[PDB]
Amino acid sequence: SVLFISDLNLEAERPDITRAFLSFLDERARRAEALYILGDFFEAWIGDDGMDAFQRSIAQSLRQVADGGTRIYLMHGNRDFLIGKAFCREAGCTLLPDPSVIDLYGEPVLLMHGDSLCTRDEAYMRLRRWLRNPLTLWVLRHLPLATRHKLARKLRKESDIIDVTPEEVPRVMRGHGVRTLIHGHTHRPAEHPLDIDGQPARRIVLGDWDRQGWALEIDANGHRQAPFPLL
Ligand SMILES: [Mn+2]
């Protein structure tokens, strides 16, 4: 089977989420064929060169699972879009761009964090366009680490989750040639049927781990998303 998770927002001061995640790795990810993490895995990320003990311990826990043979794919979210190849190398995972189309038991399936669909938040979209400009990424990777912390504090202060724009879903799905989309970000776990030019399709939204854990599990026969307690 394959597992999909997102929006864990891992951080040292949330040891309940961490414990839930490491137990999920031991009891479920180890036995799966693949694990996909669709963004906002960490609550924030200043860059791989800023990793602390907590973040390194998470990489080491992923690496145990990858060494066991489970394929781990990590996609950026908006909170942790600076995660780099050095982190992924420690963790044994593959960085997946947003968007990516994967083959899922023979079906092409679109994966995204989801915030790119939330086009009605105009302010959010302006910030996102600045943050992902290649020139901004160039300058950020040339900023000293202490200055990146100063910027992160500034952005945190100068700033509830606006949901996806309905018409964007069929537009992007048709553009990638898929009838199944999986994303996170909106904190509204659900499966949405829809139409694409008269044809049925489906959008699956992953749950966030603030109050309970979540996982979507898929195999050739079916799929299910269900929560589980943090404690
Ligand atoms: Mn997000």
Residue numbers in the entry: 2 to 160, 170 to 241
The study reports:
In the fourth step in this pathway, UDP-2,3-diacylglucosamine is hydrolyzed to 2,3-diacylglucosamine-1-phosphate (also called lipid X) and UMP. This step is catalyzed by the specific pyrophosphatase LpxH in 70% of gram-negative bacteria, including E. coli and Pseudomonas aeruginosa, and by LpxI in the remaining 30%345. LpxH shares sequence similarity with metallophosphoesterases and requires Mn2+ ions for phosphatase activity. PaLpxH consists of two domains: a catalytic domain homologous to metallophosphoesterases (MPEs) and a helical insertion domain (HI domain) inserted in the middle of the catalytic domain.
To investigate enzymatic reaction mechanism, a mutant was prepared in which Mn1-coordinated His10 was replaced with Asn (H10N). Its structure was determined with (Mn2 bound form) and without (Mn2 unbound form) manganese ion. As expected, the H10N mutant did not bind to Mn1. Although it was prepared using the same protocol as the wild type, this PaLpxH mutant did not capture a product molecule (lipid X). The substrate molecule UDP-2,3-diacylglucosamine was also not observed in the electron density map. However, except for the loss of Mn1, no large conformational change occurred in the vicinity of the mutated Asn10 residue, and the structure of the whole catalytic domain was similar to that of the wild type. There is no electron density for the C-terminal half of α6 and the following loop region (residues 161–169 in P212121 crystal with one Mn2+, 159–165 in P212121 crystal with no Mn2+) in the apo form, indicating they are highly mobile and disordered. In the apo form, α7 (residues 169–172) disappears and a loop (P212121 with one Mn2+) or a short 310 helix at residues 168–170 (P212121 with no Mn2+) is created. A significant structural change in residues 158–172 is important for the recognition of lipid X (and probably also the substrate); the binding site is wide open in the apo form, whereas in the EP complex, two alpha helices (α6 and α7) are formed to assemble a stable EP complex.
